[PDB]
Design a protein around this ligand. Structure first.
Ligand code: MN
Ligand code: MN
Ligand code: MN
Ligand code: MN
Lengths: 198, 198, 198, 198
């Protein structure tokens, strides 16, 4: 049974970058809904599978991917943020950044452009290519998870669904991306990097 | 050159069902952005076409469909609403409804379920099937327009992108669908119906 | 464990409309592979599910829908054909076909158009809409199964993947469609229709 | 008006790796059709654009991408082959291939896997990422063109639609891939590579 993870900080810890109302809604409503729906879909899958009901299994895919994906991405998202975050990362991660993207700023530019570029709901990710052994930016529609659909390992994710910023920034998604860099938990990103560079 | 249509009523005319802030943002920001982007994309298309640049033409498709679609759907949406709306339609349209869907309420149920069912951004539509000569409900992702992608003729559209309701209803998309029935411009829907039943 | 069903007739039983070389490869090679691959994928899915590995479940969807759908479609396709097929159906099914498509000939043309209309590999289907209570035509890409992805109950399917006709009709898919109508097993289609009569 | 390019060699020039019957049908029938259909679609697009009919432009996208892409891919595919092809490339291209894929043999396997990996009709590509400045492998469905849909510059393409190998290799696509490496025109691939060297 999948469960809703506690936020690692206070709902208002990311102020003024991401206000409290959003965080609380995002976590207690949006993410909680993914987990509940995921658990429901997964149980139906267990049944379809045991029955060899291929039709049901296939019918269940949209919900499995959307909700499962939602749980995956949001669980990562919370740890990617921190009230003590901001600035730039250090050591290897940074080294890989200035390398795979030129400079930190060129990296921020590229991730932001990828996030603002998403038409409709989606996510902008900083991932790691294990086959190529290097960093790589990608965008996923709706809740499709990075690894499950691209094979890339998620390091830093930026949710651009409107529920992630609309109450505070309205239609101006750019102001949102601008502000979020102030709360990036580079410690966690660094951690995720070193984890797949083993 | 495509243009942004004036709203047929006051930004606060649909209160309390859809509040003023949303309407104003939806129209002056969201829709205005579709038209501007559409005009830009279309001009690049004229160039690619004149040059026989098939790659560019294909590269331009995502933007053409998203923005063009946005303009198409929102232009229809505004007329589908009215401060004097609500209730049920009459004559033939209604006749077709009780027929193609059983009862008005069964129709509302089906359109609502189709709208709430949209994962991510999208639209729930009441369309007309010219080939079959009957009504039909459908859901379109993001801004993909009904006719351009299904061949169905749009009659009544319900925007479920979060920017269409989030500021007022938050994550509770159901409350939004519930409230919108109070401002449906059945006169306009009736009009659109009779227009393709010629 | 899913198994490869035997054909209800010999391989050359449908000559000269669909030669024996195609029937044999289509059944013994393509279908066989779907089944074996389906069993392998499900096994990996039960494991991913057990560990609650959502990422793995999502990554397995393409293989599952493709092989699972392939198994579903071809299993139905084989019974939709008969050395003694051809002609027209009777009673209820024939009636519904006139009611929904004008006439039998018109229906053929509608289903033919949808089948020939498939860009890439795919299927043309005559299905039953349980909610609307009427017949409906639909085209599915690759091996995406009808019921699993549309909800429609499959009645008659026509495979337009190139392996279903290329050795005999080459690129001229229309010649393949014209021919297949000569072996359609309307007895089986009628049975499927009557089955979804509630 | 787009035109059907002549092959740079005879139809049986690639025997026995790809027989003459396939080369001929593939060129004279499939490619020919893409071109004629592309010209017809563009004509309808210029008209829709002129009238500012967005709905029509959107509805024409499938035909445009499919036929347009088909024309782009095959035009490149023909030059990617040569009766005197085979072996390995040299200098810069060979170097980049070692740098990005480990070795030439590893590359073959990577591109082979991507090509064989295509479920349904499609293409396996060796492309060039202009932004990252390195080689990259990618698979495109149906006739979706590489550059138009991914941004990568096509260097070498392998068509895995069944019409490209079914008459000769039947369902065993791997046999087709093993063979095609014998006629790859690395002179042309090298040229394409050097062209996108900025
Ligand atoms: Mn979110
Ligand atoms: Mn909207
Ligand atoms: Mn088949
Ligand atoms: Mn081809």
């Amino acid at each position: 049974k999948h469960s809703l993870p506690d936020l690692p900080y206070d709902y208002g810890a990311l102020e003024p970058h991401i206000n409290a109302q959003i965080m609380q809604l995002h976590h207690s409503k949006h993410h909680a809904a993914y987990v509940n729906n995921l658990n429901v879909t997964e149980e139906k899958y267990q049944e379809a599978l045991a029955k060899g009901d291929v039709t049901a299994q296939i019918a269940l895919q949209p919900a499995l991917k959307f909700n499962g994906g939602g749980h995956i991405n949001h669980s990562i998202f919370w740890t990617n943020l921190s009230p003590n975050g901001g600035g730039e990362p250090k050591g290897e991660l940074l080294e890989a950044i200035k390398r795979d993207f030129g400079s930190f700023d060129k990296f921020k530019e590229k991730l932001t452009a990828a996030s603002v570029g998403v038409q409709g709901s989606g996510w902008g990710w900083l991932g790691f290519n294990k086959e190529r052994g290097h960093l790589q930016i990608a965008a996923c529609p709706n809740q499709d998870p990075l690894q499950g659909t691209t094979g890339l390992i998620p390091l830093l994710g930026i949710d651009v669904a409107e529920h992630a910023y609309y109450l505070q920034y309205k239609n101006v998604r750019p102001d949102y991306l601008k502000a979020i860099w102030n709360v990036i938990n580079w410690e966690n990103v660094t951690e995720r990097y070193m984890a797949c560079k083993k």
